[PDB]
Design a protein around this nucleic acid. Structure first.
Lengths: 150, 114, 151
RNA sequence: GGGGCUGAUUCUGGAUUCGACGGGAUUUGCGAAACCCAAGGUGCAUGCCGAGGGGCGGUUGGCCUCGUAAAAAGCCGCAAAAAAUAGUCGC
RNA sequence: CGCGGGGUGGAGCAGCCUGGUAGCUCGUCGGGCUCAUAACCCGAAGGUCGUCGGUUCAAAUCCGGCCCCCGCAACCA
RNA sequence: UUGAGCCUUGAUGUGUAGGAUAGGUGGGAGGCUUUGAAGUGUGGACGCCAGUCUGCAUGGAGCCGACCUUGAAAUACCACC
RNA sequence: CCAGGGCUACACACGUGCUACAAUGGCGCAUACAAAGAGAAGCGACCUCGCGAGAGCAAGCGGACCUCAUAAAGUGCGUCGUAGUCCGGAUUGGAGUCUGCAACUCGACUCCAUGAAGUCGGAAUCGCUAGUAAUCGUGGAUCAGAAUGCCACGGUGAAUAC
C-alpha cells in the first residue's frame, strides 16, 4: 500500500515482542519527501527522557529542495505522537539494558504518517547461530519426513 | 412499594429489599425491620399496606440517603479543603489508610486504562 | 513413562451398587476433595433421569455411553516439520474414559440451576446422540476421517 | 538565458496527525493572587531610622531580625552532579 | 443517427425462457485447526431479479416502456 | 457428412389443490372394446423419476368422459397445433 | 550520643502470594469428627458485662490433669434461583478494641455504612503421577504489638502415564 522503507534487518538482529501504531509529527519538508523522496529507516531507535519518544534513525532527505533561510537537516529526532497509555508503561519495560523501541516499518493512514513501532529485545550472537540453524532445521525435518513416502 | 428515600424493591426478601437504598446495609436493615414486625422472606407484594407505611418512619430514624449522600463530602471537606494528610491522598487518587502505593492499590487509583 | 509400566488405579465399586462405570462418575465430579457432596449430585443425575426417561439407574447411562463413545481419535503426533495429526485407535480403557470425560464436562457447560439438573439434561440427549456429546464426538471424526492413513 | 511541465492522493474547496506536546475555554475543589469586608479571636504593636542576614560573599530595592544594635531564613556562583544514560559487535 | 444484447446478494455468474415454489461461489464473519500460524475442513450471511407500468389465475420470468453498460456502421457544416 | 429449412409423425409440459408428465384456447358426454379387454411378463421411452408413455404375446373380452376433491378441468375424441 | 523523619514514598515494569469471578455454591439453623503443637515478668478458662473485637473477675497450669481450643470442609433442614444477583469484597466515612512511652506518617483489627474491579484470564508458562494435584482447617518459629510469607500438623480426596 502506502508503505515506506522498512527495517527488515531488525528482525534478524532483534526479536521484538509487542508492537504499536503511534503517529509521528514531522515538518513540512518531510511530508513531501515521505511519499517519495528517499526516506531511510535503518538503525531506528528511541531517546525517551520524559515523554520525548523520538524516531532517531530515520534518514529522509529533501528530494526537491524546499529549504530556505533557516536550516533543514535530513536526519532529525522526529517527535512521535504517543498515547498516554503507551507512554507511562515505557518508564518500565524499556529500561532493562538491551530493551529498546524500534520502528519496523513506515506507512500512511489516509495522508497521515503513522509508524509501526515495536519494543525490541535484541539477540546476542550466541543465540543467533541457533535461529539460523532452526530455520534450516524446520526445512530439513520435512525432507526426512517426506522420504517415508519418498 | 416505595419507602421514604426511594426504596422500590421487587419481591425479594424484606431484609434484602431494604438494602436497595444507600446508607443502610443488610445487618442494619434487620435492626430496622426488627421494629417492623414482618418476616424476612416475605415479598413486596406480600408486604401489607399497613406495614409498608410504617417502614417510612423506621428508615427515617437513622440518617439515610436523603442526607447521608453529602455527609461523605463534609468529611471530605474536613480533609480536602482543610489540607489534611488524608485529603492530599484523597485528591489525587491515593490510598488514605496506608496501602502499599508502590505496586498495589490499583482500584483506589481507578481502572488501569493507562 | 520411559520404563514405568505400572498398573492403573483400581476402581472401587460405587457406594450404592457394584459398578465401575457409575463410581468413575463420582470420582470425576470431585472438586476440592468433596466427594461426599459429589456423591449426592451424581446420584440425582440418573435417578431423576430414571423418572424422566422411564428407565432404570444402570440402563439410562449404559445405552447412553454407546453414543458418546468414539472409535478413532486424532493424536497430534507431529514431529514439527508438518502439523499432522495421525489418528490412533483409542484404547478400550480410554474409549469409555474419553466418552465419560466428554459428558461430565458438558454438565459444567449450560449452568442454569444445579449440577444434578445439568447432567440429567446433558445425558438424555446424549442417550440418543443429540447433545454436546455427539457435537464433541463427530467433530473429532471430522478431523479423524479426513486424515485416514499415515505412517 | 527564455518556454513548457511538476510541486504532500483527490489532480477544483469542506484535513478529522486515534495520541503526551503548544493554546484557549468549560465544568469542578477552593486557596490575599484565583480577594475584600476590623468583624470572631484579639493590646500593647506597626512603619520608617538604626540593623545583620544559611557553609563563604551577596541577596528580594525589599527580609525570618533588631527597643538602638549582632545574631536568626527563602535564593545566587561555591559544593553530596551523573554517566556505557537504545541495541549489537571487539583488544 | 438507429441497429445488437445484457443489467439480478458487497462481488462475479445462473435459475426466467419451455411462466408461479432467487441460488452459486469470490470477499466476509462463525467455528474447527494448531510448539505457533496456515494448509485444509465445514457453519452462516446477503439483491423480490436495473426502473416503472401492462398482460396474465399466476411477472424475477412475458410484453410495453424508460434508464444504464456498451458494441456497431454511420460521421461532407 | 454436417447443420439449418419445412413435410409427415410420435414424443412433449405434477404454482396450489390432486388418483393424474392436467399446456393454452375449445367443439364436446358417449367414446370404446373381443378387425381380441381389464390388466399381466416386461422391453425401451421417460422424468420436477410423480409415475406415465408403452412394443409383443399370454392375458382373453372390458375400460374410461360429464362424473371427483380442483382457480380451472378432464388427451372418452380432437381442432390450431 | 540524641529527637524527628525515612527504609511504608509511585506517571511505571516484573516476580511470588491470597481472594474470586459461585448454585458440587452462598446464606441461616441444626449437627459430628484430629494431630502437630505452645505457656509462666506466659497460656488464661469458667463466670459477669459489652452486638462484638474485648474488658472486669479470675481458677488450674513451667503441663497425658490447666489454658490456648468452638475444628472446618462433611451431614441434615430451611433459604436463594443464574445474576457481575443474597457473587466477590477492594476502595472509602463514622464509632470502638488491644499492643506499647506512644499507632500522624504506619499496626492488627472489631461494629456500622459504601459498594467497586473482576462474569473464567491471549502469546507464553509451571507443578505432579500419589494420600498426589486439589481443598478445608489447626499450631509454631520470629514477635512489646504486628503476616495472604516461612515451618509443622490434621481432614476429605483424584485423574491419567499409549
Amino acid at each position: 500500500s502506502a508503505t515506506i522503507a522498512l527495517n527488515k534487518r531488525a528482525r534478524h538482529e532483534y526479536f521484538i515482542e509487542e508492537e504499536f501504531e503511534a503517529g509521528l509529527a514531522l515538518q513540512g519538508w518531510e511530508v513531501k519527501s515521505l511519499r517519495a523522496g528517499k526516506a531511510n529507516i535503518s538503525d531506528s531507535y528511541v531517546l525517551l527522557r520524559d515523554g520525548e519518544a523520538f524516531l532517531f534513525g530515520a534518514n529522509i532527505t529533501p528530494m526537491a529542495v524546499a529549504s530556505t533561510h533557516v536550516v533543514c537537516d535530513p536526519t532529525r529526532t522526529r517527535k512521535l505522537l504517543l498515547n498516554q497509555r503507551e507512554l507511562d508503561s515505557l518508564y518500565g519495560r524499556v529500561n532493562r539494558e538491551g530493551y529498546t523501541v524500534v520502528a519496523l516499518s513506515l506507512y500512511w493512514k489516509n495522508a497521515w504518517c503513522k509508524v509501526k513501532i515495536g519494543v525490541a529485545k535484541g539477540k546476542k550472537q550466541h543465540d543467533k547461530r541457533s535461529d539460523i540453524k532452526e530455520r534450516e532445521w524446520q526445512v530439513d525435518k520435512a525432507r526426512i519426513m517426506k522420504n517415508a513416502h519418498r | 412499594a416505595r419507602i421514604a428515600g426511594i426504596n422500590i424493591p421487587d419481591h425479594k426478601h424484606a431484609v434484602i429489599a431494604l438494602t436497595s437504598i444507600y446508607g443502610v446495609g443488610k445487618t442494619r436493615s434487620k435492626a430496622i425491620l426488627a421494629a417492623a414486625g414482618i418476616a424476612e422472606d416475605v415479598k413486596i407484594s406480600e408486604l401489607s399496606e399497613g406495614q409498608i407505611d410504617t417502614l417510612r418512619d423506621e428508615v427515617a430514624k437513622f440518617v439515610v440517603e436523603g442526607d447521608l449522600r453529602r455527609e461523605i463530602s463534609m468529611s471530605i471537606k474536613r480533609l480536602m479543603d482543610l489540607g489534611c494528610y488524608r485529603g492530599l491522598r484523597h485528591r489525587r487518587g491515593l490510598p488514605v489508610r496506608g496501602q502499599r502505593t508502590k505496586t498495589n492499590a490499583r482500584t483506589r487509583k481507578g481502572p488501569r486504562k493507562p | 513413562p520411559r520404563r514405568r509400566v505400572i498398573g492403573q488405579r483400581k476402581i472401587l465399586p460405587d457406594p450404592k451398587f457394584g459398578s465401575e462405570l457409575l463410581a468413575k462418575f463420582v470420582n470425576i465430579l470431585m472438586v476440592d476433595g468433596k466427594k461426599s457432596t459429589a456423591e449426592s449430585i451424581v446420584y440425582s443425575a440418573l435417578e431423576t433421569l430414571a423418572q424422566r426417561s422411564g428407565k432404570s439407574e444402570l440402563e439410562a447411562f449404559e445405552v447412553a455411553l454407546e453414543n458418546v463413545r468414539p472409535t478413532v481419535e486424532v493424536k497430534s503426533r507431529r514431529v514439527g516439520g508438518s502439523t499432522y495429526q495421525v489418528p490412533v485407535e483409542v484404547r478400550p480403557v480410554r474409549r469409555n474414559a474419553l466418552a465419560m470425560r466428554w459428558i461430565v464436562e458438558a454438565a459444567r457447560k449450560r449452568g442454569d440451576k444445579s449440577m444434578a439438573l445439568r447432567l440429567a439434561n446433558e445425558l438424555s440427549d446424549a442417550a440418543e446422540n443429540k447433545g454436546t456429546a455427539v457435537k464433541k464426538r463427530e467433530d473429532v471424526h471430522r478431523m479423524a476421517e479426513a486424515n485416514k492413513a499415515f505412517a
